[PDB]
């Protein structure tokens, strides 16, 4: 949605390796990166800040596959998966590489129980 890329980036993980030069942090184990409605899931995420320059951070996620989610302004969610997620904050886009797939959802429903017909219904008409 509008404003997502102005939101703070939040990362949750099982383990966190801080490179001692302070410009690289490596996350592993059920990593969840969120920025507004954007959400990335990966087994491994590396965040690099080349040269200590703020705003130029690069977020790389790896999984089998890693997943991506975002709500759009039009109300339709976008979902994707790939072996690698590459998100440069300075840029306005994410890059999905290796078995990359992306989709848009136009309808959904939640509940405690849901039935769904795996055969197509037939037209019911009689003259």
């Amino acid at each position: 949605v509008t404003g997502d890329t102005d939101q703070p980036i939040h990362i949750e993980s099982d383990q966190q390796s801080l490179d001692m030069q302070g410009n690289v942090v490596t996350f592993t184990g059920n990593v969840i990166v969120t920025q507004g409605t954007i959400k990335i899931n990966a087994d491994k995420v590396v965040v690099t800040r080349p040269g200590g320059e703020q705003g130029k951070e690069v977020i790389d996620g790896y999984g089998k596959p890693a997943t991506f989610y975002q709500m759009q302004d039009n109300g339709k969610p976008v979902e994707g998966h790939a072996s690698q997620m590459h998100y440069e904050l300075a840029k306005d886009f994410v890059v999905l590489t290796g078995n990359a797939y992306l989709q848009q959802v136009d309808s959904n429903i939640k509940g405690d129980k849901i039935t769904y017909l795996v055969k197509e219904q037939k037209m019911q008409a009689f003259s």
Partner: peptide
């Protein structure tokens, strides 16, 4: 546009720190 805070948290301790 402007740089955004990057905050990561430890799932075992609940502690967070700004990168």
């Amino acid at each position: 546009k402007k740089p955004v805070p990057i905050i990561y948290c430890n799932r075992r301790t609940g502690k967070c720190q700004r990168m």
